[PDB]
C-alpha cells in the first residue's frame, strides 16, 4: 500500500498517544515503547513491528541506537503528522544527514 500524504490520519482509533501506548504491551524490543508511541507509532504484535497512525508507515527490525522520529522521516517523509511535530527543516536535516551517511 502507498502511504498517507494527507492532513487525514489512516487510522483516527490510534491518534491518541494513550491508545497507542496500549498496543505493545509487555515490550523485549531495543527501541523504548514510550519513544515509539511519541513519535506516532503503535505495535502490530509482530515482533517489534510499528506502524504510524497517521501515514500507515511500517518499520521493522529496531536497532538499539535508532530514533523513532529519525526512522519515521527517513522512510516516511510525505507523513503530515511528522511534518507537524517536527518541522520541514528538521525533515531536511534528517534526510541531508541519511544521504550523506551513506555516500560517505
Ligand atoms: C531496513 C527495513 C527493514 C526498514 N527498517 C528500518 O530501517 C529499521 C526501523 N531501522 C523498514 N522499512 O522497516
Ligand atoms: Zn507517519
Not at 523504548?32 to 513491528?49: M, T, V
Amino acid at each position: 500500500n502507498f502511504p498517507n500524504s494527507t492532513n487525514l490520519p489512516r487510522n483516527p482509533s490510534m491518534a491518541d498517544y494513550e491508545a497507542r501506548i496500549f498496543t505493545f504491551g509487555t515490550w523485549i524490543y531495543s527501541v523504548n515503547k514510550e519513544q515509539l508511541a511519541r513519535a506516532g507509532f503503535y505495535a502490530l504484535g509482530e515482533g517489534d513491528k510499528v506502524k504510524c497512525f497517521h501515514c500507515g508507515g511500517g518499520l521493522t527490525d529496531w536497532k538499539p541506537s535508532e530514533d523513532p522520529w529519525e526512522q519515521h522521516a527517513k522512510w516516511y517523509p510525505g507523513c503530515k503528522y511528522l511534518l507537524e511535530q517536527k518541522g520541514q527543516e528538521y525533515i531536511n536535516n534528517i534526510h541531508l544527514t541519511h544521504s550523506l551517511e551513506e555516500c560517505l
